A paper describes a structure:
To provide structural and immunogenic bases of F subtype differences, we crystallized and determined the structure of a soluble prefusion RSV F from subtype B strain B18537, stabilized by DS-Cav1 mutations. To stabilize the RSV glycoprotein of strain B18537 in its prefusion conformation, we introduced disulfide and cavity-filling mutations (S155C, S190F, V207L, and S290C; termed DS-Cav1), and appended a trimerization domain from phage T4 (Foldon) to the C terminus of the F ectodomain. Crystallization trials of the DS-Cav1-stabilized strain B18537 F glycoprotein yielded crystals of symmetrical cubes of 50 to 80 μm in size, at pH 5.5 in space group P4132 with 1 protomer per asymmetric unit. The F glycoprotein formed a homotrimer, each protomer comprising 2 different subunits, F2 and F1. Residues 26 to 106 of the F2 subunit as well as residues 137 to 509 of the F1 subunit were well defined by the experimental electron density. Each protomer comprised 4 major structural domains, the membrane proximal α10 helix, the DI domain including the F2 N-terminus, the DII domain (residues 401-463), and the membrane distal DIII domain (residues 49-308) including the F2 C-terminus. The S155C and S290C mutations formed a prefusion-stabilizing disulfide bond. The Cav1 mutations S190F and V207L stabilized intra-protomer interactions. The prefusion-specific antigenic site Ø, which is located at the apex of the F glycoprotein, differed between B18537 and A2 in 5 of the 22 residues of this antigenic site, and structural alignment analysis indicated an RMSD of 2.2 Å in this region. Thus, antigenic differences were minor between strains B18537 and A2 F glycoproteins, except at antigenic site Ø, where residues of higher entropy clustered and substantial differences in affinity were observed for several of the antibodies that target this site.
The RSV fusion (F) glycoprotein is a dominant antigen and a prominent vaccine target. Analysis of human sera indicates that the majority of neutralizing antibodies elicited by natural RSV infection target the prefusion form of the F glycoprotein, which is metastable and transitions to a more stable postfusion form. The prefusion conformation can be stabilized by the structure-based design of disulfide (DS) and cavity-filling (Cav1) mutations and further stabilized with additional mutations. These mutations introduce covalent linkages or steric hindrance that prevent structural rearrangements required for the transition from prefusion to postfusion.
Numbering used by the authors:
A (entry chain F), B (entry chain F), C (entry chain F): 26 to 106, 137 to 509
The structure:
């Protein structure tokens, strides 16, 4: 957890480095099953409370099976996924859906049923060429047919004991909650709950997945994050089996360097009303080296940071050439056309970084950094400035209070003239929402083609 | 499920056709009731476990009623709802809220109470002129007053049986979960859960709704989607009645043609850095014919597709003239000013379509389509291109893998010169976020007014 | 609830006034504890159902503790937060996280354990200088060790009674649900559920908070809204204690004037295709006076309105000078550069306001306001227009139906020439996504510098 952060005064941006990747590139699919009983009506006509109680619970079981059948008519299941508007589009659950489709082919559910006759965990080779870990997590068929129905049948049906009511409730419990979870999510859930897959089942699954021991260690040390990036997909009710697919991430990029880019608006600071111009670097977000290029995540919130490990889904990334990082040290470089937006919107704001805070202070806004016991320790002047988190608790910009992160690291302030000062405001192309350094230079040049004749 | 898709090479867009609409235009409101008991304290002072267990459960009932009362002080309930930023604004639950308001008028709850004295389902004519289907789904008044309180009262209060504890838990159960659901959603829930309305209640409701048998068949064949587009709204606790309103969709547009427009960026492909220009059709999303015009849904994710049926809420649409579809076959037509955005952002990306994939490949990005067993079957060259899903499993653009849909349909590739090539890059108005063909032509012409004197 | 609304025909905007603020400026943190038992294995080897039932429930307890331990390895917990893209960035849960960190220091959990030995509620002075209200809401240590384990131990372990199974289920219940809630939210939940903190605990907490009696009255009269703006943060499992932090809002701005600005597009109405220009005021949202300036909430949906009280979080605001409100009465004023976007997008739409509706009607769109019993009572002509909610039930724009709010107030229609008519369309800078009155004037002037030589 050796984090280093550099602030660039010239471009009102800061880069936090020292992070290591865990990027999801693949999917592991597993089939989870519950064995069901094919009983729709019992010939018990008693009146006492125990009788009604078993009937109520059997009604709950039967209405769960029916709800799961109505989830099946809304199948295929549905799910999908500053510069976020450019992201590509595809379904996040295509892999799971392909496995569900295979489970509909004659014999396939029966093959899984036979693999789990004598064990609750087995690898099965499906017809489409995937080997999947399959589980039987609950056997309501044996419980209803062999432990409950003999009580209700071979004797007067009122002769049960209140313990069997309570046991049947406990056996039905996990089925009703899986059904509930699927019913309010249209058969596709994320994060993966402990009712879809318990911790012991999930850790067992990870341990038997066709991945390296390092990947197994990563996933087992970060179970919650694995759950947040996993899906459960309702598949089929068929031949007295309920089957659903769990889709777990495979982190095909691990331990490459990652860095987070924070950006804020950089405006001129004249007092005259509406006389100021602005630019903001629009390439903020997470960056991870990946296979000769760089995976860029423009909605930074899509990545989950655990200490110095950054977990992201590659479906939330744009693939950029590695020269994009030159924008941090030389925004005018000729190898990559660095992205900016221009405006005359000089509204104050702050960004809390990994190890400090950037503050864009304009007009009359009060912008300060404080220590809870000592008072104000820094006051920001008009323009874009930075403070490390050392000795600081909070940053106030106008009426809003922000808390800095408490992590201790290394901070570097790179001094430089704000680049907004290099532009002639009479010819600056303001109000460009998605622009770049070259486009702006090109426009300035063109509109200095009139001033030529002068 | 006869889907047809056409790709237009000239404009980097594809249209999937063969879909049929189901658009929500109206709302059906129903009042769901639970009968409650007005008991706040029992004079039972025993010490054994059964006693405490009944007291705990009565405390749960009483705290549910209190939580429902605090939901009532946060009433009226609150809910609402590329070109999505233009959508109009209004409340999705105004109809339900109007019914809740009527339930507060003297006598109204009593009228419903009297309609349900002898039946659990009845149509009631409210004072505001709406006839609503009303339900009594749980009678905790009769259970507490007539089956539970005689046990706790007319005898020593320790003489209960553990069955009555379990029965009281089961009777209280649905009340506690409805209360829980409302409590973490500020009294307004969507999707409609099976605790708000069970499958049998919902199917009963649909069957008695004042709609045609075709609408009843649609809704009954697509219960999950109906639930996703329905609301439950907490209304009142009054005169020993809990009442909430369920608001179900009415699909007033059915079986008209719908088509989905996919678009991707179309840039020039010079090697020179920052020398390329781009345009993207901004009118992507779902389109359905509707009442002489066309309902356009710019956040395509707002529509739920079930096979070839497309379910959408008209509140998520813009109403356009039917000439908008000319943009697909003739983007330069003079009847509708086709919408585009311009830029110099030549970042690679892909869109998975209904029957294939569009790929915008720029710079050095590796863009390919593969079959899992055969390897790469297509490589995309710089520019905008398309592949059908026939014989294809996946599309890779840089570091991101996408899965194509597996549905088989008809695919047409319409060859044509990319229209970005028609523009002189020295005068192209780049970086226009919300533009159109005419605005761009108008700007080019103006800025060719200087080159005149030359 | 004296609301007044003014519509400005000149700028296609309306301002609803008469509201009073409740802005969250601070956070109150409280530590909630559950006492746990350190038992992982019982030497009971029986076979009957009661035995298994206790073992199942003990397994549930133990798997809850383990799940809470895996939530701890994904700690620090994670949470954060038209002109919304300008908002600053920081963590909403920094205060709670600082308290969690302190609970990890030697002796700190023990200090809380000793403060709650004889009471379930006490104020405790933590090592970092915060006094926190701490609660013990469940004592599973005493229940397992002193009421359950003697039954399973000092006698044959099959001698329990089914009541103790049911009592143990009821005692374990709240622990399992808190664990479930944390497990699918990565240890950070909002809204604050009744399992994290019951109504009686929450009202007790408010009553003992170091705030004024007016703040206590506000919070106690609006519990649901307090819950929606609160967080629960999983902290630690240590020394047989589960501890989590609840973070409640402190409304440091109360009863200052608030007003809501509604805006819609204002376009010219020529029949000629693609010949029209448009502008829209981009400063729509909620505004509250606050400390000499004005807190502006651009994603209006971030504020919760209860009658005439407006509850917002200052982290969702931009701090503006109070001259921003001049844009409502004089959009050309020289004290504040009023914000607009320009385009040629003349697509029809509506905004339902507090007391009426704005309608932007263009092209051939049918735009009307109706009364359910009387029919159409107003038809909107091309351009931007307004109707109050008096005698109106609904507004239709094309294919979409909107319901007006039913609240009765005062409505003022300020007549004035649409300002879009003042611009020469040949020189209007269209397609500016984030602009202002001055930038537009400046551009018009420059591009009238060519027409000079003429
Ligand atoms: C002399 C000078 O200022 N040149 C600038 C330079 O930024 C740009 O690269 C060049 C054309 O490429 O035209 C302009
Ligand atoms: C001759 C020529 O290229 N004309 C173009 C045409 O696209 C446009 O329609 C016209 C004015 O409407 O001016 C320009
Ligand atoms: C005479 C006239 O129309 N002037 C306009 C005015 O809107 C603007 O303020 C001025 C420079 O500030 O130049 C232009
Ligand atoms: C931490 O990492 C930075 C960057 O690699 C390096 O400069 C520094 O020497 C490292 N220090 C320690 C103590 O690991
Ligand atoms: C499918 O629909 C398309 C478009 O209407 C039509 O061209 C084609 O003939 C149809 N084919 C079948 C087999 O239905
Ligand atoms: C309501 O408030 C408005 C604005 O302050 C004021 O003009 C009016 O006189 C008030 N009327 C009543 C009845 O409170």
């Amino acid at each position: 957890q050796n984090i280093t952060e550099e602030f660039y005064q010239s471009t009102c941006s800061a880069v936090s480095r020292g992070y290591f990747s865990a990027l999801r590139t693949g999917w592991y699919t597993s089939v989870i099953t519950i064995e069901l009983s094919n009983i729709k009506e019992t010939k018990c006509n008693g009146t006492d409370t125990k009788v009604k109680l078993i009937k109520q619970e059997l009604d709950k079981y039967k209405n769960a099976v029916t709800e799961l059948q109505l989830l099946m008519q809304n199948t295929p299941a549905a799910n999908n996924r500053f510069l976020g508007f450019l992201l590509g589009v595809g379904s996040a659950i295509a892999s799971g859906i392909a496995v569900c489709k295979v489970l509909h082919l004659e014999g396939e559910v029966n093959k899984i049923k036979n693999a789990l006759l004598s064990t609750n965990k087995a690898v099965v080779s499906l017809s489409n060429g995937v080997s999947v870990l399959t589980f039987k997590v609950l056997d309501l068929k044996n419980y209803i047919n062999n432990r409950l129905l003999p009580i209700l049948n071979q004797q007067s049906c009122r002769i049960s004991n209140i313990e069997t009511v309570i046991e049947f409730q406990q056996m039905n419990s996990r089925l009703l909650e899986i059904t509930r979870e699927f019913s309010v999510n249209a058969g596709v859930t994320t994060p993966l709950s402990t009712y879809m897959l318990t911790n012991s089942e999930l850790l067992s699954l990870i341990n038997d997945m066709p991945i390296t021991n390092d990947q197994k260690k990563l996933m087992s040390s970060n179970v919650q994050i694995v759950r947040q990036q996993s899906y459960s997909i309702m598949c089929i009710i068929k031949e007295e089996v309920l089957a659903y697919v769990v889709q777990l991430p495979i982190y095909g990029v691990i331990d490459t360097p990652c860095w987070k880019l924070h950006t804020s608006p950089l405006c001129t600071t004249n007092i005259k009303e509406g006389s100021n111009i602005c630019l903001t670097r629009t390439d903020r977000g997470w960056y991870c080296d990946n296979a000769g290029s760089v995976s860029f995540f423009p909605q930074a919130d899509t990545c989950k940071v655990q200490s110095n490990r950054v977990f992201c889904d590659t479906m939330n990334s744009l693939t950029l050439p590695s020269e994009v990082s030159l924008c941090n040290t030389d925004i005018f470089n000729s190898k990559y056309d660095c992205k900016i937006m221009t405006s005359k919107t000089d509204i104050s704001s702050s960004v809390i970084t990994s190890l400090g805070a950037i503050v864009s202070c304009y007009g009359k806004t009060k912008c300060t950094a404080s220590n809870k016991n000592r008072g104000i320790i820094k006051t920001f002047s008009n323009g874009c400035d930075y403070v490390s988190n050392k000795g600081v608790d909070t940053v106030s910009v106008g009426n809003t209070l922000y808390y800095v992160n408490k992590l201790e690291g290394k901070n570097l302030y790179v001094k430089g003239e704000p680049i907004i000062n290099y532009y002639d405001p009479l010819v600056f192309p303001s109000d460009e929402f998605d622009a770049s350094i070259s486009q702006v230079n090109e426009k300035i040049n063109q509109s200095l083609a009139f001033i030529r004749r002068s």
